[PDB]
Amino acid sequence: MQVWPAYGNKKFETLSYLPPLTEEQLLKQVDYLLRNNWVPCLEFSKEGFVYRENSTSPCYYDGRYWTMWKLPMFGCTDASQVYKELQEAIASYPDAYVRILGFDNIKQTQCVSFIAYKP
């Protein structure tokens, strides 16, 4: 019997219960976006998690948005270009979390979010 860690084990939604993604594994997740014609977009934040400062009304939370890195990468054909921008974001904000979003312009909604860098 092992006890599930109660401290130091905070999470970032989809894929964050897996081992940290290798570069090759991250490129495969980005290629999954590209094959589906979804637009990758990076965002970053030193605060990693939601909070409730301004309202506790149902389904209101603060901290769901992070800060956009540049713009969604419309017309991206090469997953290595997302990895390149990841390294730029880390260099500018090495103390921030960085994650990769995906946008679906047919469903007209955000459709992907997974952690790409932890400080």
Partner 1 sequence: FKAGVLTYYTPEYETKDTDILAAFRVTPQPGVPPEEAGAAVAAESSTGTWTTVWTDGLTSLDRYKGRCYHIEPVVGEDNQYIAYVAYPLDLFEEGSVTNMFTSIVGNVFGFKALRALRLEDLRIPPTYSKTFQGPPHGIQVERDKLNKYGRPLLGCTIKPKLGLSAKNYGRACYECLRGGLDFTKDDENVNSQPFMRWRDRFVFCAEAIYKSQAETGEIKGHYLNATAGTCEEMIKRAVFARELGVPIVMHDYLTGGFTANTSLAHYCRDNGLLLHIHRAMHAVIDRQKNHGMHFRVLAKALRMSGGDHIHAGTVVGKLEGEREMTLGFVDLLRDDFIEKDRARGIFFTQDWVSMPGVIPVASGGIHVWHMPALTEIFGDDSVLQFGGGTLGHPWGNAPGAAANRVALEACVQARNEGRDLAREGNEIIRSACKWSPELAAACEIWKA
Which residues of this protein are in contact with partner 1, per CB under 8 A? Answer: 1-4, 6, 9-19, 25, 28-29, 32, 48-50, 52, 56-61, 64, 101-102, 107, 109-114
Matching residue, tokens 């540049």: 70
- Give min distance, CB of 15 to partner 1, in A: 6
Secondary structure of the chain in HEC code, one letter for each residue: CCCCCCCCCCCCCCCCCCCCCCHHHHHHHHHHHHHCCCEEEEEEECCCCCECCCCCCCCCCECCCCEEECCCCCCCCCHHHHHHHHHHHHHHCCCCEEEEEEEECCCCEEEEEEEEECC
- Of 114 and 117, nearer to partner 1 (C-beta) is 114
- Of 78 and 88, nearer to partner 1 (C-beta) is 78
- Give min distance, CB of 114 to partner 1, in A: 7
- Of 64 and 75, nearer to partner 1 (C-beta) is 64
- Give min distance, CB of 87 to partner 1, in A: 22
- Of 49 and 74, nearer to partner 1 (C-beta) is 49
- Give min distance, CB of 98 to partner 1, in A: 16
Q: Which of 48, 50, 45, 51 is nearest to 96 (CA)?
A: 45
